Design a protein around this motif. Structure first.
Motif, PDB file in Angstrom:
ATOM      1  N   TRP A   1       0.859  -1.222   0.000  1.00 46.30           N
ATOM      2  CA  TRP A   1       0.000   0.000   0.000  1.00 46.30           C
ATOM      3  C   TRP A   1       0.876   1.247   0.000  1.00 46.30           C
ATOM      4  CZ3 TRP A   1      -5.357  -1.338   1.076  1.00 46.30           C
ATOM      5  CH2 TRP A   1      -5.527  -2.679   1.463  1.00 46.30           C
ATOM      6  N   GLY A   2       2.081   1.115  -0.547  1.00 54.61           N
ATOM      7  CA  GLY A   2       3.013   2.229  -0.595  1.00 54.61           C
ATOM      8  C   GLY A   2       2.428   3.511  -1.155  1.00 54.61           C
ATOM      9  N   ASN A   3       1.763   3.404  -2.300  1.00 55.17           N
ATOM     10  CA  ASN A   3       1.152   4.562  -2.937  1.00 55.17           C
ATOM     11  C   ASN A   3       0.105   5.211  -2.043  1.00 55.17           C
ATOM     12  OD1 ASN A   3       2.701   3.653  -5.159  1.00 55.17           O
ATOM     13  ND2 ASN A   3       1.159   4.439  -6.597  1.00 55.17           N
ATOM     14  N   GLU A   4      -0.849   4.413  -1.566  1.00 56.87           N
ATOM     15  CA  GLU A   4      -1.904   4.918  -0.693  1.00 56.87           C
ATOM     16  C   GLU A   4      -1.315   5.573   0.554  1.00 56.87           C
ATOM     17  OE1 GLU A   4      -3.267   1.518  -3.123  1.00 56.87           O
ATOM     18  OE2 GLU A   4      -1.568   1.907  -1.794  1.00 56.87           O
ATOM     19  N   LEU A   5      -0.312   4.928   1.149  1.00 54.93           N
ATOM     20  CA  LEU A   5       0.332   5.449   2.355  1.00 54.93           C
ATOM     21  C   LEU A   5       0.960   6.808   2.057  1.00 54.93           C
ATOM     22  CD1 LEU A   5       0.806   4.451   5.283  1.00 54.93           C
ATOM     23  CD2 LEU A   5       3.101   3.737   4.566  1.00 54.93           C
ATOM     24  N   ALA A   6       1.731   6.870   0.977  1.00 64.13           N
ATOM     25  CA  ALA A   6       2.393   8.106   0.582  1.00 64.13           C
ATOM     26  C   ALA A   6       1.370   9.200   0.323  1.00 64.13           C
ATOM     27  CB  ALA A   6       3.234   7.869  -0.665  1.00 64.13           C
ATOM     28  N   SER A   7       0.280   8.822  -0.337  1.00 68.15           N
ATOM     29  CA  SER A   7      -0.792   9.748  -0.665  1.00 68.15           C
ATOM     30  C   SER A   7      -1.418  10.334   0.597  1.00 68.15           C
ATOM     31  CB  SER A   7      -1.858   9.024  -1.493  1.00 68.15           C
ATOM     32  OG  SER A   7      -2.931   9.892  -1.821  1.00 68.15           O
ATOM     33  N   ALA A   8      -1.728   9.472   1.556  1.00 68.89           N
ATOM     34  CA  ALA A   8      -2.326   9.931   2.798  1.00 68.89           C
ATOM     35  C   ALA A   8      -1.378  10.910   3.483  1.00 68.89           C
ATOM     36  CB  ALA A   8      -2.612   8.745   3.711  1.00 68.89           C
ATOM     37  N   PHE A  33       6.523   7.987  -7.985  1.00 65.83           N
ATOM     38  CA  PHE A  33       7.757   8.616  -8.437  1.00 65.83           C
ATOM     39  C   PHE A  33       8.949   8.426  -7.502  1.00 65.83           C
ATOM     40  CE2 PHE A  33       6.366  12.445  -5.940  1.00 65.83           C
ATOM     41  CZ  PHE A  33       4.997  12.209  -5.931  1.00 65.83           C
ATOM     42  N   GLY A  34       9.116   7.197  -7.018  1.00 68.95           N
ATOM     43  CA  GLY A  34      10.229   6.867  -6.142  1.00 68.95           C
ATOM     44  C   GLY A  34      10.409   7.675  -4.870  1.00 68.95           C
ATOM     45  N   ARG A  35       9.315   7.986  -4.185  1.00 68.87           N
ATOM     46  CA  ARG A  35       9.397   8.746  -2.943  1.00 68.87           C
ATOM     47  C   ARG A  35       8.573   8.065  -1.862  1.00 68.87           C
ATOM     48  NH1 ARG A  35       8.225  14.893  -4.779  1.00 68.87           N
ATOM     49  NH2 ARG A  35       7.199  14.872  -2.725  1.00 68.87           N
ATOM     50  N   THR A  36       9.116   8.004  -0.651  1.00 65.22           N
ATOM     51  CA  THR A  36       8.415   7.367   0.458  1.00 65.22           C
ATOM     52  C   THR A  36       7.406   8.312   1.091  1.00 65.22           C
ATOM     53  OG1 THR A  36      10.051   8.036   2.122  1.00 65.22           O
ATOM     54  CG2 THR A  36      10.414   5.935   0.983  1.00 65.22           C
ATOM     55  N   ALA A  37       6.491   7.740   1.862  1.00 62.59           N
ATOM     56  CA  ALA A  37       5.457   8.515   2.523  1.00 62.59           C
ATOM     57  C   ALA A  37       6.067   9.610   3.379  1.00 62.59           C
ATOM     58  CB  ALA A  37       4.588   7.601   3.383  1.00 62.59           C
ATOM     59  N   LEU A  38       7.171   9.301   4.041  1.00 65.52           N
ATOM     60  CA  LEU A  38       7.818  10.287   4.889  1.00 65.52           C
ATOM     61  C   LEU A  38       8.391  11.433   4.049  1.00 65.52           C
ATOM     62  CD1 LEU A  38       8.701  11.052   7.728  1.00 65.52           C
ATOM     63  CD2 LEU A  38      10.873   9.903   7.288  1.00 65.52           C
ATOM     64  N   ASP A  63      16.415  12.629  -2.088  1.00 64.99           N
ATOM     65  CA  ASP A  63      15.823  12.616  -3.420  1.00 64.99           C
ATOM     66  C   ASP A  63      16.969  12.931  -4.384  1.00 64.99           C
ATOM     67  OD1 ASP A  63      16.423  15.288  -3.297  1.00 64.99           O
ATOM     68  OD2 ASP A  63      14.365  15.884  -2.786  1.00 64.99           O
ATOM     69  N   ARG A  64      16.664  13.085  -5.667  1.00 63.36           N
ATOM     70  CA  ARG A  64      17.701  13.368  -6.654  1.00 63.36           C
ATOM     71  C   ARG A  64      18.563  14.577  -6.297  1.00 63.36           C
ATOM     72  NH1 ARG A  64      15.261  12.312  -9.758  1.00 63.36           N
ATOM     73  NH2 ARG A  64      15.838  10.754 -11.334  1.00 63.36           N
ATOM     74  N   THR A  65      17.937  15.615  -5.751  1.00 60.82           N
ATOM     75  CA  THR A  65      18.678  16.814  -5.388  1.00 60.82           C
ATOM     76  C   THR A  65      19.437  16.628  -4.076  1.00 60.82           C
ATOM     77  OG1 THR A  65      18.539  19.221  -5.072  1.00 60.82           O
ATOM     78  CG2 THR A  65      16.761  17.893  -4.152  1.00 60.82           C
ATOM     79  N   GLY A  66      19.406  15.408  -3.546  1.00 61.73           N
ATOM     80  CA  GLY A  66      20.120  15.112  -2.315  1.00 61.73           C
ATOM     81  C   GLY A  66      19.465  15.685  -1.080  1.00 61.73           C
ATOM     82  N   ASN A  67      18.179  15.965  -1.205  1.00 67.82           N
ATOM     83  CA  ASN A  67      17.428  16.536  -0.118  1.00 67.82           C
ATOM     84  C   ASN A  67      16.692  15.531   0.758  1.00 67.82           C
ATOM     85  OD1 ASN A  67      15.637  19.686  -0.146  1.00 67.82           O
ATOM     86  ND2 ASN A  67      17.485  18.969   0.909  1.00 67.82           N
TER      87      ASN A  67
END
Length: 156
Positions: A1-8, A33-38, A63-67
């Protein structure tokens, strides 16, 4: 449920996040787009971060920008989330692709309270120079954040 979790998380919907956390989910699962819920979490919701960190969310991801999330918190002045990040061992001296620490970002944006907490209650390397040779205090002065400058030199 990665997507749903990230979305919430991205929507700042604590209720939805908590119900979704009743499933056997991997809080460190990437979304569309390769990003976690956090990482996509809507700042200003320290309980959302806490619940995610409690389940083992990795705070140091970049992320890509190292952030990292702490970078965004410090940059936008969201102290509570930043502290929550730290109570769960987030690296306070994590650098982005430009060599900036969360301290640089908070200082640059004039977030006095965040700078205060970082300098007096964290292991933040106050004298860290970014890739261009600037310390957090240097950036504060460059951007006219005179109160941040005073505070930093006051105790540091």
């Amino acid at each position: 449920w990665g997507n749903e979790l990230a979305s919430a998380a991205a929507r700042g919907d604590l209720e939805q996040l908590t119900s979704l956390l009743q499933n056997n989910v991997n809080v460190n699962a990437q979304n569309g787009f390769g990003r976690t819920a956090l990482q996509v979490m809507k700042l200003g919701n320290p309980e959302i971060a806490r619940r995610l960190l409690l389940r083992g969310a990795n705070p140091d991801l970049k992320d890509r920008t190292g952030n990292a999330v702490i970078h965004d918190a410090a940059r936008a002045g969201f102290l509570d989330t930043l502290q929550t990040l730290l109570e769960f061992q987030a690296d306070v001296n994590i650098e982005d692709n430009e060599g900036n620490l969360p301290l640089h970002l908070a200082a640059k944006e004039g977030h006095l309270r965040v700078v205060e907490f970082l300098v007096k209650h964290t292991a933040s390397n106050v004298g860290h120079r970014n890739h261009k040779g600037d310390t957090a205090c240097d950036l504060a002065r460059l951007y006219g954040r005179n109160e941040v400058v005073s505070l930093m030199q006051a105790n540091g």
